[model samples]
Target: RLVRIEHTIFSLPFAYVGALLSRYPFTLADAILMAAAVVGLRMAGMAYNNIADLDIDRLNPRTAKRPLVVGAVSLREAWALVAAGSAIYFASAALLNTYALLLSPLVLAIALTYPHAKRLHPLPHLHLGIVLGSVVFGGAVAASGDEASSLGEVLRSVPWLYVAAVSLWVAGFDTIYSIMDIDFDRSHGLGSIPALLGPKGALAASLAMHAAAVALFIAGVEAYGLGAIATVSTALTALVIILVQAMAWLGRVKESFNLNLAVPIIIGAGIIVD
Candidate 1:
């Protein structure tokens, strides 16, 4: 309950997309370890955020009842959660491959820095996009196996276009979600697109980001040579984005947001079927 593990739906599929893009027909071990790493990192990220944002969450009525804010979980327990998650992530990475193990620390560093992003940058949502996008990179590196000789070789083979697509996609949805916290964020001087742009402007920015994301995803599919079915999935993703925006514009906010959950699943399944 504290972990909110269900939220993994937002990102887990993209990790598979990355893995399949890099190494189609990867072993069952690769799939399981990569999943463990993703979930572990996610758990740590959430607990760290709960700790870092404790005061802010306490003040914001919307978040006032969160475990950290409501004393359902103590700070010490949260740190323990972080430690457990980090251990799981690193252990999984170690089992995956040398490259995954070596790069794992860097991912953790970025995750640790992410909660502070809102305090340090006006466009912190992009920082979040980057952090989430790292999972794609992780998937690629893990799937590379021990055959790759060096980090440079691994880097060269990564589908970076896909990473950028994931980044922009996340930023778009995050911008929409930030709209709910606009008033509180503004009053508290938190950095968010909604606070900087207001709801109308933030929505426009979100639309632009989604448009760019769709373009990048299609281009990435082509660039990576995933085949016809993957291309169809991109088309479907574009259609979904259009529908989601239409729903959002029609003021069915929750449904519109929930609809986006289909995107990565569709794209990832396409990669698998390819």
Candidate 2:
């Protein structure tokens, strides 16, 4: 059921940021435990998506061959795995700190809800982005051992203008992912921004999202007092990459170009450099 590890790129950077912000250096054991916890949570979420979309997956050519839909994995077994995965995820989070344990239910709820979002919302892609972005808060809480109060501290200490930035970053890349099933989704009456807006409008919204992401990342660097050298260098690099991605989208490149290659490079570099 774990078809892709690439999704890790989206949230791992925030985890890294959380680790960096923590006053103490993590022991190797702590790092491994945290990584396992995050990976398990992500896997559980992906599995739930497969279960939720089983019928749709059978209809969509691109997804028709997926394990669960194709009978490579049974629904009953899949749900059992999801339950086990959730247990592992929460167990790891609990070991991390009190705050992590306390927040586990909310995190699990968001993760599970993402799969069902398309049933009612045109902007299910945004829900996916929200699911990913929630990791920032989770990681922050785990690292600081403080819940809302510590999160507020991090927001105040670091410039939060980047929260929206990261959100849009995920949304833009997700738009590319959605394009793959635009027609299928529309035919099935499944809601998505791409289905509502068409390719051109969807692409335009993606560009706007990336632009905001870049701008907010810059604002975050400045607000966080990262200094001129770090902030300017990161911002320029991110802007150039985003411009290239914009060109690709305007040129009407395919999913492989937009989602697999260009978007990841730009977003990944931005996260690391910032």
Candidate 3:
């Protein structure tokens, strides 16, 4: 389906982590609008990326089965869907409070340019991490009642720690995603850590990133003052991250493409205790 509803399930908890930390007692309308904006933005991003990579996908055996490459979805239809998604995202922002409304364009700019990141840079994985991790900023900003004092307070608080955790989490995971495309990328002059480094180096970098991610999350949990329940859960999840990293190295290692269920659960658990 063009909707790619399945894609929503993976990162959905990350969004909720953002929403929960927002500390805003979200009215039904607020929750719905935020959800709409999140979903629409992701849709617009993925659809446009598929369009941009259409020709390249046709050339790569791994990607040749994709809808755009296989002609299952016409280019015109894809663009139309992109337009619809953009409209939905922007409209939701318009209704989701003032700071979000003003910041929406910046978010759109970063997200739409994400696919080109790998085209130009050696490490598009970091760019993707920043783009995706910024959802917490949106969620926090949307719920911030005041522009100056409150938002300043929120900025100084634990959100940045959470953001850092998310940034590393995504960067690590997306690097694994790039592993599958390393050879294809090298042949096409695309930039990726896996392409620049060998498979062993890439895996080492990925594990290192995941380790950093877990440490930051543990730090975030402590800073938030979530004791007992959150502490135990956080430590275990950190262990789980390391265990999964080892397993994925020896086994099938697709990160963002599949449900890395442990990652989101850890974040969501922290939010619950908070």
Candidate 4:
């Protein structure tokens, strides 16, 4: 259950920021609709992953006890959930704009394909990052009247670079999550940063990715002309949060339960401040 909810953290903050930066006056109804769309899309993505990975999950001890894998949920039931979720997701996006409708298939494809990438790509984690990043762009498009002409201009006007920063921030944390499975993944021929690079190397890469994310976030603050105090304060607070998370990583605390319980609180608070 918590695993399902964790998916919301990655994009919800960006959606909030995107809506705020859209520059077009939005009503409370519009905000509610957008939130509904994001939540629906996330559920669809999760159900799709569960459906697609059912077999692999059953084989992997770490995942073998998951609801779908353990028979707590049938594949048919999962597909039904996916169908319902997709209906809600696409319907909301279509209501937002034609551009969102057009992009919906692309988003679905990315979501469905991500679970299979570990079978073939050494850099599957990066592919996941790109998929998550697409939401930021998608939200921006939905907010900007779906006009290509205005899309780039609107994106340029907002703190998009900061959105990318958030994307990388998630990527780094995801890499951390992958560490516990390094040995199992390696033995099973699954590709992951931890499998391809040793644990130490993977940790270093995560750190580098996070550092880049921080720099980009600061750049976004400057680019958006947010007041010095607000910008610097947010940056400092976010930095401290990231530093604490990094310390957790360094302590070799890789328990999924602990991470699921704590990381999102820190991330959510950081985003609210930002």
Candidate 5:
């Protein structure tokens, strides 16, 4: 309960795409290990987010029923999950290769700092997006393994554009999601896009960010040599995002936020089909 298990969908599929584009030597063992590492890191990040937001979750009526607040999960349990997840991530990374093991700490560092990052950083959305985008990088590294250094040299030629697209996609939706707590954040001195930008202003910013995301995705798809199907899918998903943002601006903030789920599902399906 501490970890919003379903949220893993946001990065896991993209991670698979990242690996696919890496053109790495394949084996079932490598695939399974990489997948486990993704789950472990994501779980740890989610658990840590809940732990860090415990006080805020208790104060906000919308999050008042969160496990940390209602005793459905305790701080002890949250910490334990963090440890357990980190162990799994580190162990899986070791199984992947030397590069994976060496880079494991960076993943944990970024994931653990997420909760407190916004306090110091002006726009925490970037931090969140980069953290999410790391799943793609992680998958790439898992595939590259011994050739990880060479991968870095040629990173520009890889699907790194998808990395940027995912980052923008996350920042945009996260900005939209922040709309749910405009009042709470302003009153409590929390960091959020809505707190920084007023309702209408924030919505406009979200639309712009999403528009950028679609463009990047389309360009990146072409750069990666994906066919017309991926390009068409990008257009359809962009339309969905625009419609959802329009509804959010129309005062169905919560409902439109829920509709944002379709964006990831659409992107994920396209990656698999591609």
Candidate 6:
């Protein structure tokens, strides 16, 4: 329950795309480790988020039923999940390769810091987006057999395009999702797009972010040299993103957010089939 394993969909598919993009025909062993790495970081980050936001979650009626808030999950259990998840994340990185192991600390730092970002930054959704988007980088790094020095060369290329698109897509959806908490966040003095921009403005921001995301995804498809399959998939993904924003505008926020789980999966499937 603490892990909320199903939420892994938001980032895991992109990780697969990154892995295959970096080095196709991934070995079974590497695939397993990559999966573990993504799950571990996501679980640990979410567990830590719940722990850090205990007070806020309790006050927000929307989150009052969260296990940590309602005593269904004790701090001990939550902390145990954090520790176990972190260990799994680090272990998977260490096994994946030297570059991945070396980059692990940076990834973990972003994950740990994300829960507190709302207190310090107005754009916490972007921070959350970066947290999710970094998984693409992690996947690529894990699957790569190149020397650490060559990392600079690869960083100058298409994967960052994927990363940027995912970031904006996440920010767009998270902005829409945050509208549900606008009143609570405003009352609590939390910094969020919805709280600061108001619902309409936040929706506009979401629309803008989604627009940029679509453009980036198309550019990434071309830059990555993906063929017709990926092209059609990108078009489909754009349609879904646009439809999701329209649903949000129609006040069907929950359905819109739920539909976003399809976005990355489509992108990954496109790459795989291509």
Model 4 worst lDDT window (10 residues): 255-264
lDDT score for residue 26 of model 6:
52
Whole-model Cα lDDT per candidate?
0.83, 0.67, 0.74, 0.67, 0.77, 0.83
Q: Which digits, one per residue and each the tens of the lDDT, describe model 6 over residues 1-274?
A: 7778777766677887777666434577887888899989988998998999888889887777788777888899999999988999999999888878888989999989987888887798898778877788888887665434665744542278778888999889999999988888878758899889889999999999999999998887767776678778889998999989989999989999988878777776776655
Clashes of each: 0, 0, 0, 0, 0, 0
For residues 1-274, what per-residue lDDT tens digits would candidate 3 score against the true structure? 4558566655556655665565655566766777777887888888998987777888998876788776778888888888887888889888876667777888888778888887798888887787777676767666554333644565553277767777887888778778888889989868998899988898889988888888888887767766577677667767777766866687667643344576566656555555
Tell me the tens digit of each residue's lDDT in model 5 across 24-124.
Answer: 66576887887788789988988988988777778988987778788988789899989988999999889887877887898789888988865665477
TM-score of 3: 0.89
Structural RMSD, model 2:
3.5
Better of 1 and 2 by TM-score: 1
Q: Each prediction's TM-score against the native?
A: 0.93, 0.82, 0.89, 0.84, 0.90, 0.94
| lDDT-superior candidate, 2 or 3 | 3
Kindly state the number of residue pairs that clash in model 1. 0
Alpha carbon lDDT at 50, candidate 6: 92
Candidate 3 Cα misplacement greater than 4 A, ranges:
145-154, 251-259, 265-274
Off by over 4 Å in 1: 271-274
Clashing pairs in model 1, backbone N/Cα/C closer than 3 A: none
Which residue pairs in candidate 5 collide?
none
Q: Please, what are the lDDT tens digits per residue for candidate 2 over residues 163-234?
A: 455567677767766876789988987988888898778887877877777777776665566555555545
For model 1 the local lDDT of residue 204 reads 93
Global fold similarity of model 6 (TM-score): 0.94
